[PDB]
Amino acid sequence: PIGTVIPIQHIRSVTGEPPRNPREIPIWLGRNAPAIDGVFPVTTPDLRCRIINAILGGNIGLSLTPGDCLTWDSAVATLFIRTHGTFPMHQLGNVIKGIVDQEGVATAYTLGMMLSGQNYQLVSGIIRGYLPGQAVVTALQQRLDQEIDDQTRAETFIQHLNAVYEILGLNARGQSIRLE
């Protein structure tokens, strides 16, 4: 094969194979995508796409093509888009609602902006409402807002998210796991 043969099962091991529904798999990916990227260098667009579909194996129509999956964000979004008939930014509210509940605000934010196509702010607005501790909400709203660009806010949102999870020292939900 030209490029790199997909270890796939290695990747699936990273993701931990499909979760419950197909409809979950999109968002599910955006979580696992970086992890997949660990196994798989996914040095081509081709690769990226073949991984996803190969993960899920029997996914209805999420089976993207080696030309849509150039980024993980586009693919993950599209698989969800597959199952939810696509959205006119109507759905992102609900999309955020589901992941945050399941995985947490940081991840949901991530899918939401991917699903939304890098207009984080809308997804973020819903997300914001999903923060664990008001310190997190406030602080995030403060620093992540203040970023160097609009998308810098997009980029570092989760980092600040995790950051506030750091300073409050949570895993997320205002736990304060960290010693201090």
From Swiss-Prot:
Q: A single GO CC term, please?
A: host cell
Q: Where is this site: Cleavage?
A: R12, S13, F40, P41, N53, A54
Q: Which domain of life is it from?
A: Viruses
Keyword RNA-binding part of the UniProt annotation: yes
Tell me, which GO biological process terms does this entry list?
microtubule-dependent intracellular transport of viral material towards nucleus; symbiont entry into host cell; viral budding via host ESCRT complex; viral release from host cell
Q: Which GO terms describe its molecular function?
A: DNA binding; RNA binding
| Disulfide bridge map | none
Give the record's PTM text: Specific enzymatic cleavages in vivo by viral protease yield mature proteins. The protease is not cleaved off from Pol. Since cleavage efficiency is not optimal for all sites, intermediary molecules are expressed.
Q: What are the UniProt keywords, alphabetically?
A: Capsid protein, Cytoplasmic inwards viral transport, DNA-binding, Host cytoplasm, Host nucleus, Host-virus interaction, Microtubular inwards viral transport, RNA-binding, Viral budding, Viral budding via the host ESCRT complexes, Viral nucleoprotein, Viral release from host cell, Virion, Virus entry into host cell
Instruction: Relate the protein's function as given in its record.
Output: Involved in capsid formation and genome binding. Shortly after infection, interaction between incoming particle-associated Gag proteins and host dynein allows centrosomal targeting of the viral genome (associated to Gag), prior to nucleus translocation and integration into host genome.
> What is noted besides the main data?
Foamy viruses are distinct from other retroviruses in many respects. Their protease is active as an uncleaved Pro-Pol protein. Mature particles do not include the usual processed retroviral structural protein (MA, CA and NC), but instead contain two large Gag proteins. Their functional nucleic acid appears to be either RNA or dsDNA (up to 20% of extracellular particles), because they probably proceed either to an early (before integration) or late reverse transcription (after assembly). Foamy viruses have the ability to retrotranspose intracellularly with high efficiency.
What does the record's free text say on domains?
Gag protein contains 3 glycine-arginine motifs (GR-boxes) necessary for RNA packaging, the first of which has nucleic acid binding properties in vitro. Late-budding 'domains' (L domains) are short sequence motifs essential for viral particle budding. They recruit proteins of the host ESCRT machinery (Endosomal Sorting Complex Required for Transport) or ESCRT-associated proteins. Nucleocapsid protein p14 contains one L domain: a PTAP/PSAP motif, which interacts with the UEV domain of TSG101.
Name assigned to this protein = Gag polyprotein
